[PDB]
RNA sequence: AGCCAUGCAAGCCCUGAAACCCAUUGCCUUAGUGCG
DNA sequence: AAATTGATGATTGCCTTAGGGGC
DNA sequence: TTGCATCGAAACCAC
DNA sequence: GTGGTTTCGATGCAAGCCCCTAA
DNA sequence: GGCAATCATCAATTT
């Protein structure tokens, strides 16, 4: 039994299509059902995953990009795209609780940075006590991430031992990438992260064009590489020096060779994160420093 | 003694042109010195304001738009702009403490909205405890704004009596506009606020074109009129209904007539705010009479 | 008096061969001046 | 006299793109 | 796909 | 038995652009 | 016109 859902929070908007008729509300969960949606939240879908009722999702751009060629008709388009382009739809899986702690950590940190910048701009005690409370929340949730990482083998067995990696690098890298059966090649992970290349051209933001990578992992990798640089970490600092020397003959100012070296190291680190996680979880393979 | 300063926070970047040579640092404050700058912070200008040293500032776009016709040379360009078009330069004045409380209030409110929206998207004990702390801060600063408004004649003598006006509406309107002596006509305030009309076209944001109005006062005015609409406030609700009815024959949907009526009411309210603030401060009058003002 | 269409923010999503090809962001403050 | 919290040294440059659309 | 922008009045609460 | 704090009702609509640049 | 992105090391502080 396939059902296509045009999701919403407001029950007036919701619609479901069985391929023949339209329904206004969802059933009780059962593993006879496969659900397909254009990005339904885990808030609504977790009851189904919790009983083995599969949920498949596709990008919020998939229908808009089919339309280059009422709302309730869009449930029919979602159903039609599941029939015509079943390669797009990917299985939603229930998250680990680390991803929640890391989310709340970054939700506190942006409030902390936001508050620090105002303390730079002019000084008042109200924001200084707030800054202290927000710093405590950020600290306690870093300690929560630190605690939860004990349940994450790729940290305790590997990322813990790399000099210049600690709880926040690993908390972000884990939760932003997630289950490593989602990426059947290293290049799928680079493409998802924003490190792929077409004809020698990088992925850049461009107004009026939807992006197709999770840019937060490329922003995160920037800080992982920044740490490798400042700590002079093992294999990875050597690779930075080697590339930064190799590339400066080819580019017009030092900062371009720097950005190219950073990109090179971030890509090779993601290759190693892939390799180690695939070997840990028992997925197919196709050097990291500490891993043997 | 005129000095043109290309201001900065880091003293390595600071540059001043005295009309003959480039200097790296400012002199001791004296009313003999007139400073001209492109948006210098109050942090750096306040020592001069307290000693009567006039500080004149111009829009950060004035030089960029003049160039349409070393890096330290910009200190000279400011000097050149002050010499050729001194009308672009306006006297900076030390802000009232109300503006600080309102700024901190809006900083807390935006953190509250941000946190409540996260609570809507996901529920966690961490953010609920935080949401309660942030709400407390917003509440205490609302009381701080409310308390500071006692020192503002335009509040206690006029805006306080209008149904639908309280401490946040009035605090925002006062601090966003600042001194009303900056606008010699109601049309100047409409232009600065974003309500002016050119050959029948309104001011709209536009990629690649620097705006020339303080859009935050137009966003605030939207809430002032929204308050009048929900409360059915006297003169202003009548004006809203009358204009929305007069305009609906000329537009294709109810929402467009609504936006035109809202704009009309906002402009009339700003005209009354201008008039009352001018009379309270003792400035010249010009030109519906305000409701509670006599 | 006519002419006349305020924004801010949150959540989530994204899928090039392991050479070579190869330029991450998120914020903060402040400014802005129609006609008779 | 150990666990927790604080401080601050580690390096690295200085374009444009201002910047994703969508649910 | 969402929630927010404010005040005025009725009710609840503590001391 | 008052001063202060909480909850909630009022009213209006479903474009169009997301759409400021500068110090 | 500004800041932040985090980890490692040495030390100070409370308990
Ligand atoms: Mg939909
Ligand atoms: Mg978040
Ligand atoms: Mg400058
Ligand atoms: Mg602010």
Residue numbers in the entry:
A (entry chain A): 6 to 74, 86 to 302, 317 to 322
B (entry chain B): 6 to 74, 86 to 303, 316 to 322
Task: List sentences from the manuscript.
We show that TIGR arrays are processed into 36-nt RNAs (tigRNAs) that direct sequence-specific DNA binding through a tandem-spacer targeting mechanism. The structure of TasR reveals striking similarities to box C/D snoRNPs and IS110 RNA-guided transposases, providing insights into the evolution of diverse RNA-guided systems.
The TasR dimer binds one copy of the target DNA and one copy of the 36-nt tigRNA. The DNA substrate undergoes a dramatic 180° turn as it enters and exits the complex. The 18-bp target sequence itself is unwound, whereas all flanking sequences are fully base-paired in canonical B-form helices that do not form any base-specific interactions with the TasR protein or tigRNA, consistent with the lack of a targeting motif. All 9 nt of the spacer A-complementary strand are paired with tigRNA spacer A, forming an A-form helix, whereas the non-complementary strand is single stranded and is separated from its complementary strand by a ‘wedge loop’ insertion domain of the TasR protein. The 36-nt tigRNA forms a pseudosymmetric figure-eight shape as it interacts with both TasR protomers and both DNA target strands. Once accounting for the pseudosymmetry, we observed that the edge repeat interacts with the Nop domain of one TasR protomer, whereas the loop repeat makes almost identical interactions with the other protomer.
